[model samples]
Target: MMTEDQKFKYLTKIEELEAGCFSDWTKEDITGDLKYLKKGIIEESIELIRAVNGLTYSEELHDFTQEIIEELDISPL
Candidate 1:
């Protein structure tokens, strides 16, 4: 289980990521901009990799993360 401080730390990291370059956009904006959507998805995938790295690995987690990487067609874990 995570301590309150650790949870807060991760939450802060998420906030920082959301506020960084390639932040998500509104539906209207998305409709007009495929590049923006793609950029946000790529950034989100990178963030997911970072978060996954800190976890204790299991077959399920490994499979799930692998699936995510496969779907993104970005690169290996």
Candidate 2:
């Protein structure tokens, strides 16, 4: 079980990673942008969910991830 501070730290890292992945389309790094984002998202999801799974389910995290899933559902690829 993670302490509150650990949870916060992990969640913050997750948020940052999620932002980076989701913002890839707007970045100047045009080379393999989608590939980079996809790798980042996979790593971020694994790390974040691993930490969250240690403790109780956080609705905040759940909701944010759900939003990402919803957005991905509509992306044309």
Candidate 3:
């Protein structure tokens, strides 16, 4: 776990990087055979982060379903 100071420093670094960022190409500029590549990359990154933290797609789905059920007083089982 990162300390509060470390978190602040990391966020500051990220802000600095974003401030200095410039790219000739935008994600919208991807085309042809690479059109679906961005979608896959984003999805894979989500799954990768979940995996690193010992989470699974089904766990997230179940939690979301339970939240809805509790909100509406509905039972799934």
- Candidate 1's C-alpha runs over 4 A off are 1-4, 18-77
Query: Which candidate, 1 or 2, has the higher lDDT?
Result: 2
User: What does candidate 1 score on TM?
Assistant: 0.18
lDDT of 1 by residue, 4-24 (tens): 333333333344433332332
Which candidate's lDDT is highest?
A: 2
Candidate 2 residue lDDT tens string, 1-77: 11233333334444654453544221123222222222223224444444232211233344233333222322223
TM-score of each: 0.18, 0.21, 0.21
Deviation in Å, model 3, residue 17 alpha carbon? 3.0
Clashing pairs in 2: none
lDDT of 3 by residue, 1-77 (tens): 11223223323333343332332111333322322122222223355234332112333322112122112221111
Candidate 3 regions off by >4 Å?
18-49, 54-77
RMSD (Å) per prediction? 13.6, 10.7, 16.5
- Assess the local accuracy of residue 57 in candidate 3 as a C-alpha lDDT between 0 and 100: 32
- Cα-based lDDT at residue 73, candidate 2: 24
| Residue clash pairs of candidate 3 | none
Clashes within 3 Å, all models in order:
0, 0, 0
